[PDB]
Write a protein that binds this ligand. Structure first.
Ligand SMILES: Cc1ncc(C[n+]2csc(CCOP(=O)(O)OP(=O)(O)O)c2C)c(N)n1
Ligand SMILES: Cc1ncc(C[n+]2csc(CCOP(=O)(O)OP(=O)(O)O)c2C)c(N)n1
Ligand SMILES: [K+]
Ligand SMILES: [K+]
Ligand SMILES: [Mg+2]
Ligand SMILES: [Mg+2]
Ligand SMILES: [Mg+2]
Lengths: 358, 324, 42, 324, 365
């Protein structure tokens, strides 16, 4: 019987999505051609931010166990994927984060104490400062992708030379909204950057159980847009991919999908939950290779690292104090932010709760 | 001019496109084609594809696109081709856009109007005619508007678009062009959340919306010959309810019925009944009864005539209340 | 106008009492079942 | 044995898995992990990956899978991780499985039980604690079950799974391990559509479901200190309503209130009020009032204690009804 | 700045999905190696069913215009896509049609008069004969794809050597449920055949507005399953593609996506769509020459296997059977509200028990 070349098909499509890498685990440059143009100060700032973010995760976990934080999704291990991608953005760019993408929106301008109030569950945590282009973290997986296509189209219609960037995880890619978002952006040639952070696990679910797709980058093919699979533990690879995607978008050529290969060293969240598979990825730590890369260039030192750590600890201490001091929510606060003009039922209930709060 | 309801809707859209450069209309086949029911006919030709455009076939994506566009300062007026397809876009509506003002503590908002046809009597295929207003009525942060006349539709649609929070605007397929009514040219608004008296009466209050307002007015004409004076209240908006107008009427008559096309377990009739019993039970001569469809899935098309409530059911239930 | 719970209004009719006449001994003038009975018994 | 509600759910699931080889359990993290709240712990270990399995992270696909498995003779028991995620799967639930027996004139049917947690008081993130039972209650062809005790959960879940049409089984987060109760080992059932009296009383009927049953029992004990005797009726099933039990109670007491955790414009309380007004208005000494949450989006977690209805609100409203 | 090879990527991927063809427009065999093994009688039957279905289309449109049918999505132009794909199936295979895929489920065993009752809007039209493995036409675009994944999984779980096959259009490929269905089937390695009938328009919307993907077949890549693009006007190509997908599926290798390039000569449906609003006559005439009936006739004639008499016989047969079916539809008793209540649940809940009695009384007249 006649045989279609399906094995070849699978293999040939795979060949189009090889893992992009600039820096190996020893901090050696293995792709000089693709090295992004960054000043010495930029490279240092990149490291500072990743170190800072690692400390933020350690403190957030401790503060959660103390009851001083609420909902928290650990980020340790994803600093290249989260901080180096953000580092490629401009202030005019719009971020649509998932629930784990708190570090990106902090670096983009959300005050740390508001991030803590988001965790705790306080409307003030979500009152984004004006002109800071972010949404609060999205709980509905994939919803941020279809919203991102609309933000990107909005930017395009206004002639802005900016992108919408959005983040989800490997589990995220199985959602209808994941596919609809990339396809809509593709269809409108919209300046969107879609980032898939593949940390191997959707809660307890291995990525192998999401899909038989051999990469997640290749899902771009279904929208007819370019995809890139990147070493997600490599700050320079991540940066270079998002930078390239941004350039393509802002010049009218449409979106890109980027899959980062990373890991989260911690639990899914702090709500509910191999030792050797955790140890394997511990050696690939983005901090390790970037430390080596900078130290070989005379751009980093124990003293600078220790300084950033203490700076992070002090800023976290003050942010949590500032969260403690924000006034408690009243039902009349929640009613007042429901509409511009209160409908009759909410008018009545406002008076009831005003009187109760008196 | 003497307009059909669909003409009145088009006129509202044209006026808002003209007076607000941020207004965008989009959805399946609304562009070149001018809509499967011609509600957006000529709009793309007059105002351009940057402003009136077709989308890929995906309701969820249409919802997301509207949310995104709103975050970028636009005034989206997306279309969902039939409201039975609302199940594909329930998260964008109820999980997202209804909640964004609240979620961001007023930092962002959703000046979105979702237009969708619904309603029976025209023998559509499955999930085209379903009355699902009862679902979005339960979501805080939305307003839900359902006109019964060309005059109401144009004035409420303009109000809806100008409203800075999400409004679901539901267009009854049976009423699109089955009659004409005088409609003022130019812009006018009708308050959202405000009912109106379609027929003044003394003996019983008949509360209705959508195609059921006509069935109620028909019933009230026949009830008059029987010596029963019915006040017919068109809700116009089903969320939020115009409590003052409803209670005002019920306090005068001391008797009321609520009439909906939706199944008894769906629609918004139970909410109206609960509000009346709460605020005006010291005026009630009798229970507030409901006229509603049987609690089955929307009827196979040939069974619409025996399943849909009609003026005869309104008469029967009215007289039930009169004789209680 | 009269202020009265539906049960009272229905009881008035079943026994042919015009409720608009009866003086209510309930809160704020509300007519009660025992007032219908006090109107019938003189 | 003394069991928590989550333990009773697991025991019921085990019983059905063993009794009926067509029973399958599947969803996000239900297999290896035993579920987010451990409701399926050890079930895959006992019955294997053919019977209890993980799916990709996509609610709509899980719905579709359940439907297709049902077409192939299986008795699917899928899980939706939190019911705020129902918006993703509304078409499979309301547009499809609820309608299939009707759609095919009895040729196919959907012996599906959807399990999903909901409910507040445990400081979850956004869209985890919302009460969305009001939405599925409006869809003909579905039954919606909400237990408040271990004994009820095990008896109702076995009935749900055995029922040959779709049942939504909603599990309150706060009640999973709030207390232990004696629960018979082995199988037993409790009828779907049947309420029960949690506390006998003569002065006021308090109708509640979910976590509000405990709040109402707490209110009743305080009311009794003042010689106000409240009859507490646990709906157990919110669709269909146990009319005979509800009405029997209200006719005895002459007064009633309905208590729900959902927003006033949501939940099922309005339906209960409307059914009471319709069938027993002649028994009412006072209007039937509702205890419900404010009509805002579900509260930011730290605002839960000021927003959620509690026994103090039940006491206040009961007294309002006693003094009306 | 460093440049990723984005253009090469698009080029090389789409190159993995060339259009599969066996018969060209003149009915010449242009791919002899791929020729499916079909007997002379099977070849004739395939032609008979495609002619029959073309008449069914013409009559259905005429009946609708007379008010004798209701909802109708024309099928002329898709006969290779619908009929030759079905021809590759076995009785045990389960079909999940879209609203236009009525001919597939008729040939799979749904009586013609029930297909007509489906159009009119009558519960009996959906009462599929027992053992006929189909669902009624699905109105919600893409819902049939996620349901198909579950059917396929169920077949796999019972160890049946059968497939679930489902159909959607170019428009449907934009739906989340399209994507979730193929991904779920891939993830569970389930025996599902997904067919996308690309007839160039989703109502009024050109396929190029759905997606910038060069092919619809390449959307398979997101689920990690194989995709094939086929000349949807070529009965032999469609057949061979579905047969190959079936072989893969039943031998435990998981699903396939198949995109057929076809055309609908008629409007979207009979409820007001007007193709003059969104496409040219020159495009319609261009696809008129690709008519699957034209090449397949030439192919059969050159083998001596078809004649005008045989064709006129099929045509007269279709017209008589259609006339009987509409009669049988008319003779179906009118639906009662008590009927619709009774098919709602195995055991009626209290509210429906109450309403049953009310409408029973109403119907006693
Ligand atoms: C629509 C939706 N369905 C289910 C969930 C439950 N859920 C939350 S986080 C999570 C797992 C995370 O998966 P992934 O997309 O890989 O993101 P990660 O947490 O690894 O960053 C799941 C299943 C959700 N938040 N939203
Ligand atoms: C979920 C859903 N959304 C929208 C519609 C409205 N609609 C009905 S038919 C149709 C055209 C579909 O185009 P396509 O998938 O290419 O299939 P075709 O009708 O051309 O066979 C549309 C948009 C529907 N039936 N279902
Ligand atoms: K609006
Ligand atoms: K069931
Ligand atoms: Mg993950
Ligand atoms: Mg979806
Ligand atoms: Mg098409």
């Amino acid at each position: 019987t006649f045989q279609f070349p399906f094995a070849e098909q699978l293999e040939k499509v795979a060949e189009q999505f090889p893992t992009f890498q600039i820096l190996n685990e020893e901090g050696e440059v293995v792709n000089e051609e693709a090295m992004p143009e960054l000043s010495d100060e930029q490279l240092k700032e990149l490291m500072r931010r990743m170190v800072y973010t690692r400390i933020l995760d350690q403190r957030s976990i401790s503060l959660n166990r103390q009851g001083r934080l609420g909902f928290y999704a650990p980020t340790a291990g994803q600093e290249a994927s989260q901080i180096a991608s953000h580092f490629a953005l401009e202030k005019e760019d719009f971020i649509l984060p998932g629930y784990r993408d708190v570090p990106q929106i902090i670096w983009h301008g959300l005050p740390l104490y508001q991030a803590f109030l988001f965790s705790r569950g306080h409307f003030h945590g979500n009152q984004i400062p004006e002109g800071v282009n972010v949404l609060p973290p999205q709980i509905i997986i994939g919803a941020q992708y279809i919203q991102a296509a609309g933000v990107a189209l909005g930017l395009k219609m206004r002639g802005k030379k900016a992108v919408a960037i959005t983040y989800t995880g490997d589990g995220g890619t199985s959602q209808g909204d994941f596919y609809e978002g990339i396809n809509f952006a593709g269809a409108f040639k919209a300046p969107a950057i879609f980032v898939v952070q593949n940390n191997r696990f959707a809660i307890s679910t291995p990525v192998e159980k999401q899909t038989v797709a051999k990469t997640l980058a290749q899902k771009a093919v279904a929208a007819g847009i370019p995809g890139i699979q990147v070493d997600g533990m490599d700050p320079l690879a991540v940066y270079a991919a998002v930078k390239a995607a941004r350039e393509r978008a802002i010049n009218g050529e449409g979106p890109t999908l980027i899959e980062t290969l990373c890991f989260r060293y911690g639990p899914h969240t702090m709500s509910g939950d191999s030792k050797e598979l955790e140890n394997e990825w511990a050696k690939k730590d983005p901090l390790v290779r970037f430390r080596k890369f900078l130290e070989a260039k005379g751009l980093w030192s124990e003293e600078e690292e220790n300084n950033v750590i203490e700076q992070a600890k002090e800023e976290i201490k003050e942010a949590i104090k500032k969260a403690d001091e924000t006034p408690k929510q009243k039902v009349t606060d929640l009613i007042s932010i429901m509409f511009e003009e209160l409908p009759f039922n909410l008018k009545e209930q406002y008076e009831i709760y005003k009187e109760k709060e008196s | 001019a003497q307009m059909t309801m669909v003409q009145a809707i088009t006129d509202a859209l044209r006026i808002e496109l003209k007076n607000d450069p941020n207004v965008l209309i989009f959805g399946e086949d609304v562009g070149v084609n001018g809509g499967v029911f011609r509600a957006t006919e000529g709009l793309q030709a007059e105002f351009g594809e940057d402003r009136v455009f077709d989308t890929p076939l995906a309701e969820s994506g249409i919802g997301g696109l509207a949310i995104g566009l709103a975050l970028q300062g636009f005034r989206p007026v997306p279309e969902i081709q039939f409201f039975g397809f609302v199940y594909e876009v329930m998260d964008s509506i109820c999980g997202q856009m209804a909640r964004i003002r609240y979620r961001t503590g007023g930092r962002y908002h959703m000046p979105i109007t979702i237009r969708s046809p619904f309603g029976g009597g025209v023998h559509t295929p499955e999930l085209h005619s379903d009355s699902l207003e009862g679902l979005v009525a339960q979501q805080p942060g939305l307003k839900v508007v359902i006109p019964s006349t060309p005059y109401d539709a144009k004035g409420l649609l303009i109000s809806a678009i100008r409203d800075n929070d999400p409004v679901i605007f539901l267009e009854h397929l049976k009423l699109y062009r089955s009659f004409r009514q005088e409609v003022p040219e130019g812009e006018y608004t009708i308050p959202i959340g405000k009912a109106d008296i379609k027929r003044e009466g003394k003996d019983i209050t008949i509360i209705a919306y959508g195609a059921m307002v006509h069935e109620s007015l028909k019933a009230a004409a026949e009830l008059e010959k029987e010596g029963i004076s019915a006040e017919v209240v068109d809700l116009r908006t089903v969320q939020p309810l115009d409590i003052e107008t409803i209670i005002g009427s019920v306090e005068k008559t001391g008797r009321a019925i609520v009439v909906q096309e939706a199944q008894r377990q769906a629609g918004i009739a139970a909410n109206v009944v609960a509000e009346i019993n709460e605020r005006a039970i010291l005026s009630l001569e009798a229970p507030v009864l409901r006229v509603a469809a049987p609690d089955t899935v929307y009827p196979f098309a040939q069974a619409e005539s025996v399943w849909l409530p009609n003026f005869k059911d309104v008469i029967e239930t009215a007289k039930k209340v009169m004789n209680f | 106008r009269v202020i009265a719970m539906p049960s009272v209004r229905k009881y008035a009719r079943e026994k042919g009492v015009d409720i608009r006449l009866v003086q209510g001994t309930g809160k704020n003038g509300r007519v009660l079942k025992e007032d219908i009975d006090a109107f019938l018994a003189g």
